[PDB]
Design a protein around this ligand. Structure first.
Ligand SMILES: [Mg+2]
Lengths: 349, 350
């Protein structure tokens, strides 16, 4: 039978290419953490699983309230300002379902997370994108944006820069609707915008454990917003959105801030070292606040270099988007992996 | 807060009541399996996790293709006719998003899974429910149902009976939109309706490992439908909807059919024994094809019995709905737990 027209017409999300066999590869294409999650996460999962996995026959916590209390203490927010999710894509999706009816508009920055658009298409919401200027400010933003939701990836991926808090504050005041600050990479930056959730009423911040907590293999994320917004999101989400092992992992991960800090320290160290090394062989590198770098070879032939890396079993991300085709987004792996990647880049020339 | 009107006005799903500390309780309120999952599942999870959880830093299989291949071999369907999900609620939700635009209608049986309505409310779809007749057929069903999606829980929960394949076939032919056969409890039944996915084009079957495979704490579900339907559902779901441990568990669970069969056999045996014992003390028990029973005491005071069980640390499910208030839905636990429950029921009856 007939699907909704928009569902029939839309094209599914197109991820970056990745070969099925990646065992013998240095994988730097999806911004995954180079280090394992906290040893406390492993213990927590094993302890929840038990000797025969009997605990898995019982439904998990629908509320994930214990996760909200731990997250609440970490960020300094009452638990009613927090909601857990099976990865942050879930909250992005539900924010659209909560605020944008079919036909209404949502917006975001080009380039950023193209999936914001895919989610809009499923809802039937219209999409409007805005580009960035040389000094990384939104170009052509109206006096007042009337879209129902605006998604700002901050720090911005794939480019890397963060937006000054005062500038995001301005954007919040100019948005008639909701401003969603996607802070997927904020743990790698020198600052974040959590304070804006308190300063305004239309600001929402999303976080995920996929990048900074080395749990991309698990789907754990959250959103921080005014209680009224969280209340609406709680009615929309599936009553059971996080399994028992994910809940055990989440609490352990958030509690081990020492490990998180050490991992982020090491990644930032490698990021800055690699930035200088790339520039030493003629590459243009955008200063980054995330766990990746957008680099452009001297000849601006990003695909040529991507092919050279692929031939050497090094996988990075290359965008066909004309705006980004000149370079590539390289995730920051272990220092050893980046030394090998640099060696390959030198051979490629 | 500028919320869509339907979102602002809707009431969030209201689950059955359950106390925080029930470690010393006999829990029979959410149809959870009384037995642990397959030992192969525990092994699979341990292997994927590894000694340091290093594998968890890498994203899972976005496609879950391996799971579809295993499920395909189990059910006799090409993998293109299958889609995996983080619990079947996810596929129920996406079926609504795929076929019912705001303002359009979806329907289901009263009583069944009220969450079908909650999901419809989020979408902004209208909801129409139909009651059942004495012979377990849908009362007042139109000659042709025009709703975009009709959800049929089969076996039906909370009542228990499965709808005969022949009758579901009739419903498929009478539905102008999609007919979704929620087979959450089919592994406990004598038969199922998988064949209808092949016979018709508008039929979809959902399954979950939450009840029959003892993995309610690791929500893994799936849907079987024509490739074109699966294709649409694949564009709607999040690219990463199942974690690495869940993918490991799913393959192991589906492959251990011996364990599944044994668990289902033990549950069916306890179910039938308990059914007989309840009738012997005056209860009316609807013949069930699931892992639960809808039982009504001789005095038709289900809430009194529920309260009596609660006082004795036995938790079942009681519905305030006038149609179901006289009885209760009792999940099937271990034989020992049901003997204790029977003893409690006899005392409450006296
Ligand atoms: Mg006594």
């Amino acid at each position: 039978i007939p699907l909704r027209q928009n569902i029939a017409s839309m094209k599914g999300y197109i991820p970056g290419y990745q070969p099925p066999d990646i065992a013998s590869w240095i994988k730097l294409n999806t911004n995954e953490n180079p280090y394992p999650p906290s040893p406390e996460v492993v213990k927590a999962i094993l302890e929840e699983l038990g000797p025969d996995g009997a605990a898995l026959r019982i439904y998990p916590s629908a509320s994930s309230q214990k996760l909200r209390e731990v997250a609440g203490e970490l960020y300094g927010f009452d638990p009613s300002w927090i909601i857990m999710a099976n990865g942050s894509d879930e909250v992005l999706n539900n924010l659209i379902r909560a605020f944008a009816a079919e036909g209404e508009e949502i917006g975001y920055v080009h380039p950023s997370y193209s999936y914001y658009g895919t989610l809009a298409e499923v809802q039937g919401a219209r999409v409007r994108t805005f580009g960035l200027t040389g000094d990384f400010r939104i170009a052509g933003f109206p006096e007042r944006y009337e879209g129902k939701v605006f998604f700002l990836t901050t720090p911005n991926a794939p480019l890397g820069p963060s937006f000054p808090l005062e500038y995001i504050d301005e954007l919040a005041r100019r948005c008639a609707g909701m401003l969603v600050l996607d802070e997927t990479y904020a743990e790698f930056a020198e600052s974040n915008a959590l304070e804006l959730v308190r300063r305004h009423e239309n600001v929402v911040v999303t976080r995920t454990l996929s990048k900074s907590y080395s749990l991309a293999g698990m789907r754990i994320g959250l959103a921080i917003a005014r209680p009224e917004v969280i209340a609406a999101l709680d009615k929309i989400r599936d009553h059971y959105n996080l399994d028992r092992l994910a809940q055990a992992a989440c609490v352990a991960a958030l509690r081990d801030q020492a490990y998180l800090s050490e991992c982020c320290r090491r990644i930032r160290e490698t990021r800055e070292w690699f930035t200088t090394e790339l520039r030493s062989i003629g590459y243009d590198v955008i200063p980054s606040q995330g766990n990746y770098l957008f680099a452009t070879p001297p000849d601006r032939d990003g695909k040529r270099v991507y092919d050279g890396l692929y031939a050497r079993k090094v996988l990075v991300r290359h965008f066909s988007d004309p705006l980004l085709a000149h370079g590539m987004r390289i995730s920051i792996g272990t220092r050893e992996e980046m030394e090998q990647t640099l060696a390959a880049l030198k051979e490629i020339g």
